[PDB]
Amino acid sequence: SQARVLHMVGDKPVFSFQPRGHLEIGEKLDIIRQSYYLRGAGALLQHGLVNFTFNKLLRRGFTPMTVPDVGLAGYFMDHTVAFRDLPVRMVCSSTCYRGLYRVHHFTKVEMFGVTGPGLEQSSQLLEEFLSLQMEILTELGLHFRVLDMPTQELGLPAYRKFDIEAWMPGRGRFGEVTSASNCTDFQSRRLHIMFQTEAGELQFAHTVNATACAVPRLLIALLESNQQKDGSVLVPPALQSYLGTDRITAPT
Amino acid sequence: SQARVLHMVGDKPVFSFQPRGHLEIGEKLDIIRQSYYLRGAGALLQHGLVNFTFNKLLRRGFTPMTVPDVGLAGYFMDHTVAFRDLPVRMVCSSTCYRGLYRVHHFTKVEMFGVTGPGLEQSSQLLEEFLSLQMEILTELGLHFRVLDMPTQELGLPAYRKFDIEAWMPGRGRFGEVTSASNCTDFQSRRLHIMFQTEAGELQFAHTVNATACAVPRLLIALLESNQQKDGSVLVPPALQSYLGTDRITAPT
């Protein structure tokens, strides 16, 4: 029916001032300009978010994939996986086409899974993906909530769907930053994504999808969460490696 | 009139066998699939080349920028730079739309320059860009040649243009992997990209463009150049960090 809050993580940052919007923050620091384009520390923040997520998923055994620009399931079309290969975990960074809240083009890192027979297998994989999303956001120090989306209402092609909303002080609200859904055999039956059972039968596999990183929405959450009174932005330690500093400051 | 070879770097690799095409190599190593799809070590090669070039340009003083996808000049439209800021060096990694030779989507790292008055300034900047390109290709261990493209013969919107062709054993020929052109005041006069002189006059600046990395063509050159008799393919040391190995050996 209605979305249920499954988890709260972190706390709302406390400000001695009225929090500013991400655009105001970015323009004052000259990291957001003009459509829109990121410059300097903003470009590095995009780079750092993507690489941080991609490397973390590489360490967990996800197989890297690069694609020309739905698609992820489509690559396994008419393909069959070995029982010894289940579960299949794939990670891919790609450009998607549809304030910076709603732009036409953006970079996103996606997780893709193909798993053994039935709900037990697909559900474990979905919870594993959800824990990766929660881990990534906690190490980035964001305050967020996990929501259990309805599935047989408003739609249908999903057995379970988890969304994660990060707190955005400037917007004054929670905003979706990632989603993870178990599609069971919906994609498999349409694309002939098969798996070989232990006994040797071919059966329609189960597929699981999850966003690992959406750069625009995480940039909004980070800038509005880590802003300072003087208009500077503190850099999360996980991203300090890529930015070369612990605080983004306005230019001279 | 016709292109002149300005520089030779490296030597053609020596094989005891007939060199294979990049597609054969990829299919045998399961790093190329399908359209086209890169998997495992192939995806790490692409991703790692982009990061290697991007980090090198960051260390050399280039300011990063990211765009939602011609464009590089277009963002400086109606902008004026201070004389003290010349030259402006920008580096951008982005997804571009146009074997792996001609796919519809691919990642490319571009160099962009805005420089002081006239040919002396723009030419120094163009030669700097060419030297960075040559440094990158040498550190990747590729054999290549730098060629002086004609400009007043067809063309026109270029005062000087350098192309670099990397040797591709499987194709049996040289293939363009990077390009660098000095466009002087063509782009500035059409996009109102100005610079302010010391005296206080505004004048059309000079623009310089150069490819820092085109992943498809470099992957082709690397796979075909570092291939072994076993179908293995050696990993250049600069990329061993990202691949975690010095040789791709195909799955069991």
From Swiss-Prot, chains A, B:
Q: Which UniProt keywords apply?
A: Acetylation, Aminoacyl-tRNA synthetase, ATP-binding, Ligase, Mitochondrion, Nucleotide-binding, Protein biosynthesis, Transit peptide
Respond yes or no to whether keyword Transmembrane is given for this record: no
The positions annotated for binding ATP are V103, E176, V177, T178, S179
The entry's cellular-component GO terms read: cytosol; mitochondrial matrix; mitochondrion
Q: What is its main location?
A: mitochondrion
Q: What is known of its domains?
A: Consists of two distinct domains, a catalytic core and a N-terminal extension that is involved in tRNA binding.
- Sum up the protein's function in the record's words: Catalyzes the attachment of serine to tRNA(Ser). Is also probably able to aminoacylate tRNA(Sec) with serine, to form the misacylated tRNA L-seryl-tRNA(Sec), which will be further converted into selenocysteinyl-tRNA(Sec).
Write the protein's name.
Serine--tRNA ligase, mitochondrial
Location of this fragment in the whole protein: 184 to 494 of 518
